[PDB]
Structure 1
Amino acid sequence: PAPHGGILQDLIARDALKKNELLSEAQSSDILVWNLTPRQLCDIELILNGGFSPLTGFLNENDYSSVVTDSRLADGTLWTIPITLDVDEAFANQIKPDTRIALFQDDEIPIAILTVQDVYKPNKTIEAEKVFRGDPEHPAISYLFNVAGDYYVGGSLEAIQLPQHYDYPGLRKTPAQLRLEFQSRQWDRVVAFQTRNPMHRAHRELTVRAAREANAKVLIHPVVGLTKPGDIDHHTRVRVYQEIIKRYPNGIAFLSLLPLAMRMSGDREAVWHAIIRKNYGASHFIVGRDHAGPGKNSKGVDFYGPYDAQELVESYKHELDIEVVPFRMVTYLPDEDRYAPIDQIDTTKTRTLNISGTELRRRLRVGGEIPEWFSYPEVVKILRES
């Protein structure tokens, strides 16, 4: 399908012919330099590779304000999560419109040149309330107030190179690369699966079922960048994904890593995910229960309703030109030796076998056996005493 906004803003491709010139400038002694923070590095990779199309830079206050209150850029284009370059007060004081800033990675690798449009002090309370629902315990709000700089710098970017990664080379396909991969296989219908956790037999079954019902193929698109605090190590997860994809039906699935910095912003994040996956070439997107949700706060109160994400994305589906596929968990039916959607099993006389996240975690820590009906032996081994 077409990128969000119609154009894949692959700035690496756009500025390829001026890389030497931009690199030279970024290394000059007179240019202002900003060392990107971990979250900014994830965000900038997705802006530069077109993952955040139509974005071509960090949001100026005009667009930021519209995103915060109306979930749209100033021109009306759907966009739910503000992507801004947050800096400290002193740095903001040295900036003025038209100032060109060299953005670096690890204070040594030139990533891009930002042409400043504005520098402003956002009202973070409004951002926390409108974008993240206001609970002080929400991961995005804690980040917003404690870690994020208090000043935002809006501006357009010119690309030099994508952030450098030293893990799993070639596994982070860009939107252009994935789109070509799909086209090369004549995959016009692709259902994307978001995850920041390991995958078991049930996930293999639900994604395969989703693909078959939609007459499409499967894109396992796990996040490897910034996920939820306490998640399984990224190396363990990647090994799990590489192994489990081998268990999929002949030529129905493809695996690629997404270097996204999740905000754990529930429904708004689910819409953002749909946009991102559309930019990466997907036609369908699975939306889970409490999709991208932080769970419950200290008082046992859910940050988001379980179906808020599904409902919000469904409401924007026509505008996004993407199809929403509700996450349909499957379970194992021993009396029929088959897998079926938990929904399919009405409150009647039907037995099922399951292993809770709690039981799984505890068995893995004591070397307890895990049944094959729950997960493939090769996958379990990877999670074993990890």
Structure 2
Amino acid sequence: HVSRNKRGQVVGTRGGFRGCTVWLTGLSGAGKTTVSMALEEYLVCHGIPCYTLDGDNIRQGLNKNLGFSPEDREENVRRIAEVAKLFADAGLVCITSFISPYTQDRNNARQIHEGASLPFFEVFVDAEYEKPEAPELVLKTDSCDVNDCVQQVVELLQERDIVPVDASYEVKELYVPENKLHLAKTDAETLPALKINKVDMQWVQVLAEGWATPLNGFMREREYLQCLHFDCLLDGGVINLSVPIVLTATHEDKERLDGCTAFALMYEGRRVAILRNPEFFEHRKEERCARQWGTTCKNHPYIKMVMEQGDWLIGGDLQVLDRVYWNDGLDQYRLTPTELKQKFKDMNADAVSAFQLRNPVHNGHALLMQDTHKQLLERGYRRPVLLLHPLGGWTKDDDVPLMWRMKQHAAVLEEGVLNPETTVVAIFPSPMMYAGPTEVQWHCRARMVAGANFYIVGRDPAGMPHPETGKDLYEPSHGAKVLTMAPGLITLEIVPFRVAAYNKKKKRMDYYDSEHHEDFEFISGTRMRKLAREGQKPPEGFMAPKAWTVLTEYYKSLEKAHHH
């Protein structure tokens, strides 16, 4: 037969052999049944195949020829224990729910398993029964609600390496350990230096914090090519990475540095990282832009930056020094993927849904977030958390600045449109590229690294008007169509939505409908700015009032940037 290890690797979606038996015991019928069913739902919800043995599938099948004689009851428990063992051997978490009153029979069931090196967890649901003398768990089901009870079981299974403690992709930070920093800064001081700009420093941050795991630094030619042609890294496994994470260089700088085994990156006169074992390769700007954006339009605001950069790229192993902070009053929201994962744990989340943003949050956005939350509750998640995740790297000139967005978002939560108790507000450090279906994959994969389990996507993600025509640069359905089928995003689920707009009839935000076109008022950023300058407000229900007020303040400051 195939080994447990091989059988393990195909059983579930999660990898590793985790066969075992969770053996409930105790008088309480409702207590065992509520715990077994809730545990089963939890396991299935977290990608772990399981199967329950109870009265409803054993009594009238395998044990249909057994009655209430002492010998028949003994045989009843024996048969159940042997079948539980076969499920555990198969790689499933087998849950059994029978009173199983006698120590002898339970101890025998245990030996059937431990004898075959299969974990056995005796769980006493405590509400001529013989109490277990050393159960792995005691559940006081009359005094603790079902969800606490199930959490006690999940914790045991985590303890015993059955349920993964954290089943997102391991984050690879590129920061030097803090006890090695002073030495690493001293080392950096002896190296040649290459001055970088602010956008470059933001990409240093993206790498440092692990958002581009498993990169070891700025992309080498091999990674750059896999990215541009396939939207994935390929070496050692397929993982989505659809945008170049590169450092540019002029011909002059390449000539100065090619040959060095290491150099420092310098931002605002400070040495912020070391690049080791560098490799210099051609940028090829037109080809990059065409493949990455689906256009080479010179007035696209990110492409404009790329076009002014040098003709070389430098790949290498990046060691970033001092933790990157910007000291602008928003560092409190700049959580790393590791910090986000600890936050979700502290909140006891059992699902994390992520929402990428570069604009003010209106109640159309909120609709997608609210309906996601409802969908997760209905699927069996008990404590879903929303990761409201505005982007905070470079953005284009007419976007609403980050500080104003963060103030607006704070007003939306203050008004209760989103619940602050089940929402984490954090800033994603990447520059924004405005590359539509190519970029949405990057936005999604970054959140995956940070432990998101569900990624919300709507219409025209990461898009903008074509600078020459004013028509949409990208077809507005493509971002969700591409993301739903994109390779290398296996630890999360994409949750796609139709566009939401203000429905004049219902006086609220709702999903757009082809028939009923005229019932819908679409309100853009341009239109918001126009309304504000004439002292008007969008329709009631489009945006939380306090959050609209923040925007009037922004628009007033823009107007100021006079007769009296």
Calculate the TM-score normalised by the size of structure 1. 0.89
Taking the aligned partners of 1:151 and 1:294, their CA distance within structure 2 comes to 28
**Residue 217 of structure 1 aligns to a residue in which SS?**
strand
3-state DSSP of counterpart to 1:221: strand
Q: Secondary structure at the residue paired with 1:214?
A: helix
1:24 corresponds in structure 2 to 186
Instruction: Report the equivalent of 1:289.
Output: 459
Q: Which residue of 1 aligns with 2:174?
A: 11
Change (3 A) 1:177 1:329: same
Q: Aligned partners of 2:207, 2:464: CA distance in 1, in Å?
A: 25
Post-superposition CA distance 1:69-94 (Å, at most 9, x none): 22223514321101111011111112
| 1:156 CA displacement | 0.5
2:275 equivalent in structure 1: 114
Letter in 1 for 2:247: L
Correspondence 1:279 to 2:443: no
CA–CA separation in structure 1 for the residues paired with 2:315 and 2:180: 22
Q: Confirm or deny: 8 A CA contact 2:174 2:217 kept in the other structure.
A: no
Per the alignment, residue 66 of structure 1 pairs with: 226
Q: Which of 1 and 2 has greater Rg? A: 2
d(CA) in 1 for partners of 2:391 and 2:422? 20
Partner-residue secondary structure (3-state), 2:340? helix
TM-score between both structures, scaled by the size of structure 2: 0.62
Tell me whether 1:171 sits opposite 2:339 in the alignment: no
| Partner residue in 2 for 1:262 | 432
Query: SS of 1:378's equivalent?
Result: helix
Q: What is the correspondence of 1:5-154 to structure 2 with a 5 Å cutoff?
A: 6-12=169-175, 15-28=177-190, 31-75=191-235, 76-96=238-258, 99-108=261-270, 110-137=271-298, 138-146=300-308, 148-154=309-315
State the AA in 1 paired with 2:207: I
Q: Which moved more, 1:216-225 or 1:96-105?
A: 96-105
Kept in 1: contact 2:508–2:542 (CA 8 A): no
Cα pair 2:240 2:488 within 8 Å, conserved = no
Find the partner of 1:239 among 407, 410, 423: 407
Q: CA deviation at 1:120?
A: 1.7
Assess, with a 3 A threshold, how the Cα gap between structure 1 residues 229 and 288 changes in structure 2: closer, same or farther: farther
Return the match for 2:351 from 165, 168, 189.
189
1:244 to partner: Cα distance: 1.2
1:366 and 2:526 matched: no
The amino acid that maps onto 1:7 is E
Q: Residues 143 and 336 of structure 1: is their aligned pair in 2 closer, same or farther, counting only changes over 3 Å?
A: closer
User: Percent of aligned pairs with the same residue?
Assistant: 26
SS in structure 1 at match of 2:345:
helix
The answer to whether the 8 A contact 2:194-2:266 is kept is: yes
**Distance of 1:290 and 1:129 partners within structure 2:** 19
CA distance in 1, matches of 2:500, 2:460: 17
Distance in 1 of aligned mates of 2:401 and 2:292: 28
Q: CA 1:305–1:150 in 2, change beyond 3 Å: closer, same or farther?
A: same
**Aligned-pair distance for 1:27?**
2.6
Structure 2 stretches of 5 or more lacking a match?
1-165, 378-383, 558-564
Q: Comparing 229-238 with 134-143, which one deviates more in the overlay?
A: 134-143
In the TM superposition, residue 162 of structure 1 has moved relative to its aligned partner by 3.1
Supply the AA of the counterpart residue of 2:349.
W
Secondary structure at 2:233's aligned position in 1? coil
Aligned residue for 2:486, secondary structure, equals: helix
Higher RCO, Cα 8 Å, sep 6+: 1
Per-residue deviation, residues 50-82 of structure 1 (Å, max 9, x unmatched)? 111111200111211221222223514321101
Rounded to whole Å, the distance in 2 between the matches of 1:7 and 1:318 is: 15
Q: Answer whether contact 1:48 1:56 (CA < 8 A) is retained.
A: no
CA contact (8 A) 1:208 1:218 kept: no
Amino acid at match of 2:292: V
Rounded to whole Å, the distance in 2 between the matches of 1:307 and 1:206 is 16
Does structure 2 retain, via aligned residues, the 8 Å contact 1:96–1:116? no
Residues 80-125 of structure 1, C-alpha deviations (whole Å, 9 max, x = no match): 10111101111111223552111122122x3211103311222222
Which whole-Å CA distance do the structure 1 matches of 2:297 and 2:529 have between them? 29
CA contact under 8 A between 1:60 and 1:155: conserved in structure 2?
A: yes
1:352 offset after TM fit, Å? 5.4
State the distance in 2 between where 1:291 and 1:368 align: 28
Counterpart Cα distance in 1 of 2:342 and 2:259: 38
SS of 2:421's partner is coil
Which segment drifts farther, 292-301 or 84-93? 292-301
Query: In the alignment, is the contact (CA less than 8 A) between 2:239 and 2:487 conserved in 1?
Result: no
Q: Is 1:160 matched up with 2:321?
A: yes
**Contact 1:331–1:352 under 8 Å retained in 2:** yes
Equivalent in 383, 386, 396 of residue 218 of structure 1: 386
Q: CA deviation at 1:154?
A: 0.7
In the alignment, what sits opposite 2:9?
none
Deviates more, 1:351-360 or 1:160-169: 351-360
What CA distance in whole angstroms lies between the structure 1 residues aligned with 2:428 and 2:398? 19
Q: CA deviation at 1:356?
A: 4.6
Aligned partners of 2:170 and 2:261: how far apart in 1? 27
Pairing of 1:330-369 with structure 2 (within 5 A): 330-332=500-502, 339-343=509-513, 347-348=515-516, 351=519, 355-369=523-537
| Further displaced range: 359-368 or 174-183 | 359-368
> Which deviations, in whole Å up to 9, do the C-alpha atoms of 1:238-263 show, x marking residues without a partner?
10112212322362211001121011
Q: Secondary structure at the match of 1:362?
A: helix
Instruction: Please tell me whether residue 382 in structure 1 is matched to residue 550 in structure 2.
Output: yes
Structure 1 residues 85 and 187 mapped into 2: Cα distance closer, same or farther (>3 Å)? same
Q: What is the root-mean-square deviation in Å for CA atoms of aligned residues?
A: 2.4
Preserved contact between residue 19 and residue 159 of structure 1 (Cα < 8 Å): no
The 8 Å contact of residues 357 and 391 in structure 2, kept in 1 or not, is answered as yes
Q: Give the gaps of 5 or more residues in structure 1.
A: none
- Cα distance in 1 for residues equivalent to 2:503 and 2:289: 44
Distance 1:251 1:118, change over 3 A: same
Paired residues of 1:95 and 1:119 also in contact (CA < 8 A): no
Q: Match for 2:200: what amino acid?
A: Q
How many angstroms does 1:347 deviate by?
Answer: 1.7
